[PDB]
Design a protein around this ligand. Structure first.
Ligand code: HEM
Ligand code: HEM
Ligand code: HEM
Ligand code: HEM
Lengths: 141, 146, 141, 146
């Protein structure tokens, strides 16, 4: 459950991603695939090489989904219902993998937004990503 | 932990630039802020009531130094983490009863702190090598549970 | 995130519990303290012996809180705000312990209400307890 | 895993009443229903679309029987689980890449099934003994990760 301060921090911090959405999302995926190679099993027919246009394209989708989540942070299950059906019902992604991607997203933000990534904002972003992860791993239709 | 010579060189080179006096305290402090239940293990440390109090707490900074030194001891002998961490494992597991998920959390907070400090130099391959190290350290700390 | 059907399963199951709510709460605590002795560290001054009136008194409190949560399943953060502050802010309970108590509650229910404890009801109750656990381990004031 | 003589006697007495043709299937089936992502590992088993479909699936029942047999074997080798389960650990960790939290989940679903079947006989001390056993089995299966 997010506090009012959490929501404020997340909106402010993610708001700085802007046009770098695709870039940061792609970097986060690349970090995950490299650091935790078991995650590649969910993408059997992807080009997952360094600098892959397909990963770049996917990174933008993930980032834009996170932008969607921020714009609906008080009512996320209804806003992300399609993404939950994809990840929980169709793909059956093990919940551990969401912790891995969430960590790689935080590493990416820490590497690119040093001023923004304070301990308080770090804490809020971690809670936010855990909340998104819970929605995406739940079946609630 | 099995690092390639290339990975070991990358990790060692970066670690040589890590501030011995501060980075451990930053990681421990962030653990206490981001995962607040961990504060329960540090009652004697004084004021942990706000993020600023935590990050400025002298005992957190001091303790963080020790924590970093233990990671440093791990890097010096990657082929014997279990041996290196045996006493610390007895302490954290048998005495303190820290749930081992928290070992993973601290390792990952340290990785975030390195990324924060080094920016673009903390490349995905460098991170991948560090993830092997912190997984190895967490496993070694948890050995008395296994 | 609970489905509409999950909420119905939970309400129906907890209804069947009825007047035994307190007895089951006490038994779940006893099961937890015995199976996972580290959990006793949160109750250092408690009489934790078998048949402890103090554990019995506490089991009733836990059960009543769950009954309240079932009654407010659509609005649990608001309903449990005081309890969340107690467990997350004051007592700082490690979230692993909520998994342990949730398991011991399910075991208690399985032992006492075997006909009611179908696979679907098992699934809904597990999700509900996970949801309560997340609220009680969150600081959201 | 060390059990007191009282615990061993109690564990053995309860296990003797287990229906070995059904309980493994009930436990596996409930794993697939309660934790649905685990179905990804059993795509070839056919219809898993509803709880009724899962619980009545012949391949779930048959496979469950094997799983139960592994638990049964473990009960006879509690002092050497890491050795006994070494082949299974290599299969589940190195080949299938099952995240080890799932081993814990299956053990706890098995405990729920024993509670369901044996009610008042599954007392808290009996449960405590079985938790030691399923923790030991889960740890041994995860050994390749440690
Ligand atoms: C914050 C967490 C996540 C977000 C916001 C997210 C978002 C998305 C989005 C927006 C899509 C594209 C959906 C569409 O095309 O309509 C997608 C697809 C997909 N996601 Fe994620 N995802 C997350 C976590 C994960 C994780 C952790 C995994 C696995 C390790 C995963 C595996 C996949 C796969 C396999 C696809 C389909 C790729 C394809 O075959 O086209 N997702 N996700
Ligand atoms: C995962 C990597 C970790 C490392 C490398 C590490 C290392 C250390 C070291 C070197 C000490 C000092 C030991 C001594 O002076 O004898 C220590 C003490 C301690 N650690 Fe950790 N630790 C880790 C994780 C954790 C976690 C996650 C927690 C709690 C959530 C924790 C709680 C404590 C406590 C309570 C003490 C004793 C503090 C005191 O003296 O009052 N440790 N640790
Ligand atoms: C479904 C999960 C839980 C529920 C519904 C719950 C509910 C409650 C309730 C109603 C109280 C009484 C508060 C009051 O009257 O002031 C309480 C107190 C307490 N709870 Fe929980 N609780 C849960 C999980 C846990 C867990 C997992 C732990 C630790 C392992 C824990 C540790 C405590 C402690 C230490 C107290 C205070 C006891 C005292 O010193 O009086 N709780 N809880
Ligand atoms: C925790 C206790 C567990 C035990 C004792 C156990 C035991 C076994 C046994 C005896 C086999 C047969 C091996 C063979 O035929 O050579 C097997 C296979 C398998 N296990 Fe498990 N297992 C456990 C947990 C899990 C979990 C949690 C999963 C998650 C999905 C899993 C996935 C599989 C799969 C996919 C197979 C192969 C099925 C096939 O032949 O298609 N296991 N396991």
């Amino acid at each position: 459950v997010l506090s009012p301060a959490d929501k404020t921090n997340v909106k402010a911090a993610w708001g700085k991603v802007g046009a770098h959405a695709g870039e940061y999302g792609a970097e986060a995926l690349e970090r995950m695939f490299l650091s935790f190679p078991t995650t590649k099993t969910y993408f059997p027919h992807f080009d997952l090489s360094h600098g892959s246009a397909q990963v770049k394209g996917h990174g933008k989708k993930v980032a834009d989904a996170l932008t969607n989540a921020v714009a609906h942070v008080d009512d996320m299950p209804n806003a992300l219902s399609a993404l939950s059906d994809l990840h929980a019902h169709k793909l059956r992604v093990d919940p551990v993998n969401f912790k891995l991607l969430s960590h790689c997203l935080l590493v990416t933000l820490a590497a690119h937004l040093p001023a923004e990534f304070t301990p308080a904002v770090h804490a809020s972003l971690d809670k936010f990503l855990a909340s998104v992860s819970t929605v995406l791993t739940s079946k609630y239709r | 932990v099995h690092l390639t010579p290339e990975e070991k060189s990358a990790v060692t080179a970066l670690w040589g630039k890590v501030n011995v006096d501060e980075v451990g305290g930053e990681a421990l402090g962030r653990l206490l802020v981001v995962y607040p239940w961990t504060q329960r293990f540090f009652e004697s440390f004084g004021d942990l009531s706000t993020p600023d109090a935590v990050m400025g707490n002298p005992k957190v900074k001091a303790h963080g130094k020790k924590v970093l030194g233990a990671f440093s001891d791990g890097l010096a002998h990657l082929d014997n983490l279990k041996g290196t961490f045996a006493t610390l494992s007895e302490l954290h597991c048998d005495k303190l009863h820290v749930d081992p998920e928290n070992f993973r959390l601290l390792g990952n907070v340290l990785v975030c702190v390195l990324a924060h400090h080094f920016g673009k130099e903390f490349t995905p391959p460098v991170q991948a090598a560090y993830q092997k190290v912190v997984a190895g350290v967490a496993n070694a700390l948890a050995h008395k549970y296994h």
